[PDB]
């Protein structure tokens, strides 16, 4: 056929719409994950029940997605209790929730009753939470849940202001989840593991090298 | 079948399940030959290998009351980290974790074959191409040199730390590789 | 076929058959292209080669008389022992030996097939992959890192140490290759 | 396929598109291996050569703005005389003209091909024979004499003299040959 | 209608592709024509035949056309003989292609007779031939047909560099037409006339102004 006679603009605008597509682009995405959280360490000198800040950076393989969006709300957050102790075992493993980083941690028993999303358990039940991890049936599983309805939009973050009046920290933290050994053994042990299956959602992407 | 190539199914103790009482990173393993004596003596005499299979099965020989488990993973880049602990663990390939007493049901693996309620770490071989047979590890070198040689490394690590060191098992691994190119097994370095 | 690939078949001559009046050790060759000049001409224009063939043909050109032989075999891993007698040369790879004034009758292998009477010592080329080509190699590196540009090493020995040192026969190299990624001869390295 | 016959696709950078600000005469290319560096490296290597594509794609870098076209057309006897003017290029064979500014869509004809608005030359390859592939032209010698190595010239005239002798494009030439009988890259001339 | 608001681009390509039709401008263009070759004429001093160059430049109309090519491919080229003369006439004419430049010319009846395409006639005979000129009938004519199987792609020239070697000459002369007397007349005449009967294939038109 003919030639055709290309017609030179001064320009040709180059524009782009929208968060470049990819794997994390979405204005929102949702996530469920099964996480370790951590050992439930057993102090043999003190009471005090051990926190934990219920935040995606403290969930290595979900904070990797999580950093590339600037906003995040949870949905499930549940904290699975798996012993890995004879049932010869005594003592107990105390679980609940703190919604306001100003309230003080539970050192007993009582308190830790009095607490909302609070489970007790011999340190030697729960094993059936395993399959909790992967499919399902919680009926036989020591579960710690979060409150998660009513709790807004958070910013992700990378980090905590912990010397900071506890309602700025409020701001970016959820919960945290307290965790606490009914007794002292005569030395420090790890009865058991703490998994945690987070379900949340994450909105408006960012440059993961941004995120803080 | 043949034209410098013999399959090769074997058997055999690969080590001791260590439990440290103040170390808490697991304890690696490289999957190669020259790690296994039996089988050594058998790939030694060839310049080429390549894993077909590879498993390595946690046997227990310990009371049902002691407390613990196993953590099992691979690592296929000697440039990664050895897992100080267990989320480290569950969050890597070929995790699997079991009470450091249970296992027993696997020595059915060990003769025939029949894993079910077999504590097992599966390394990924397939895609794992011919590697040179060994007698060593240049770990004093860059990682990607040693990848070269290392398709992957056993990652095993006690869940806690027993009031003292102990060993509540022993690994065996179940690998099945094809052999190349043959070498003098004196010359085979 | 196509899209950065096309094969390559050439000959060569590889070097002379040099029998040490006093070293019983082997000869080492190392089997890439740039130790052709022809074939390395060509090669350097291209950013990866994969041998598909390379056989090293033994053509002698001495009396009937000369007593000894030639011992050829191939070495595939550089951290491997070079070959220091017979019994070394003859448990390796390829290994192929015949007296030093045998083997006119393989010249038809130069030009056309029929190795029916040669003295070839064929390297395994079947599953040797994509190799990047080099100008050169690190000698002083960790044998490792030369394997990643070594399919392998030819080792040449003589049986026999003559009274002086002597060239019996040629080496002639009979290569089959494809090259894939195009590059400027000159910064090929 | 085979037998002394080696067939080859490459692309090279031929020259610089040059305007002469005094000069109306075209500029002419020998269309053989020697003029390309890369493609000069392969075919020295051989002793027959046989252009089977030959084509040489115009690639403009300059302002839209620019004034001129530029004009190509391929001599196919040496005796011809190259084109001093639009209307010589216009009447004589693979004749192309397109506004300097004009080409860029053609970069996909580099990679891969789908030469749509592309400002291409081809030369007439079909019909055309088995040449030896030298290392010079003889242009001190009879036209006849140089034919029998020179396929064809591609003339490149600018339609145009600029104020100032300026470069506005490149050409680059996608050829595609096949080679026959080997010789040392060095005694190749 | 509405005036159409024409945009201007900085400039608009001016392309042609191909040669500018016409005439000649196809790739290759194949033409069959009849061209007077020349005379015979008869020495009557020497028997050496007489050569004639079988080459385009040599056919002035055919030249024409061919000069607008820059290769050409002959496929037929016949030399049809035209007797001029009364059945009394004695003599013969001989004729032969030479295909190597290099080769000698033949001075007499046997070696004409051992060269390619040889053919001798009666002076007086082939009159029919002139039918052949334009419709058909070779059967009653006296053609010397050079072979052309087998003759590649020549370059079109203006010109034979003669001073060469023959073997530079044999890159563009396909053939020579050797034209011999059976005898030598008491003084020189032309007993007839030479006719081509030209087939070829013109290929890669070029200005003719450049051709040479
Ligand atoms: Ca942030
Ligand atoms: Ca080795
Ligand atoms: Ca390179
Ligand atoms: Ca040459
Ligand atoms: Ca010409």
Redesign the interface.
């Given at each position: 056929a003919?030639?055709?006679?290309?017609?030179?603009?001064?320009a040709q605008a180059s524009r782009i719409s929208g968060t470049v597509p990819g794997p994390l682009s979405s204005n929102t995405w949702p996530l469920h994950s099964v996480?370790?959280?951590?050992?439930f360490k057993r102090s043999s000198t003190s009471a005090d029940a051990t926190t934990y800040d219920c935040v995606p950076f403290n969930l290595?393989?979900v904070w990797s997605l999580a950093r590339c969006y600037s906003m995040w709300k949870p949905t499930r957050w549940d904290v699975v209790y798996l012993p890995?102790?004879?049932?010869?075992?005594a003592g107990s493993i105390e679980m609940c929730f703190l919604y306001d980083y100003a309230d003080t941690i539970p050192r007993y028993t009582g308190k830790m009753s009095r607490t909302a999303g609070f489970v007790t358990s011999s340190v030697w039940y729960g094993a059936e939470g395993c399959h909790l991890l992967s499919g399902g049936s919680a009926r036989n599983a020591v579960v710690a849940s979060m409150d998660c309805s009513r709790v807004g939009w958070k910013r992700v973050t990378s980090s905590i202001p912990s010397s900071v009046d506890p309602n700025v920290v409020n701001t970016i933290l959820p919960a945290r989840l307290a965790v606490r050994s009914s007794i002292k053994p005569t030395?420090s042990?790890?009865?058991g593991?703490l998994?945690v299956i987070a379900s949340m959602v994450l909105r408006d992407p960012v440059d993961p090298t941004l995120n803080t």
């Open positions: 003919e030639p055709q006679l290309q017609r030179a603009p001064v996480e370790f959280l951590a050992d290595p393989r890995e102790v004879s049932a010869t075992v030395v042990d790890t009865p593991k998994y």
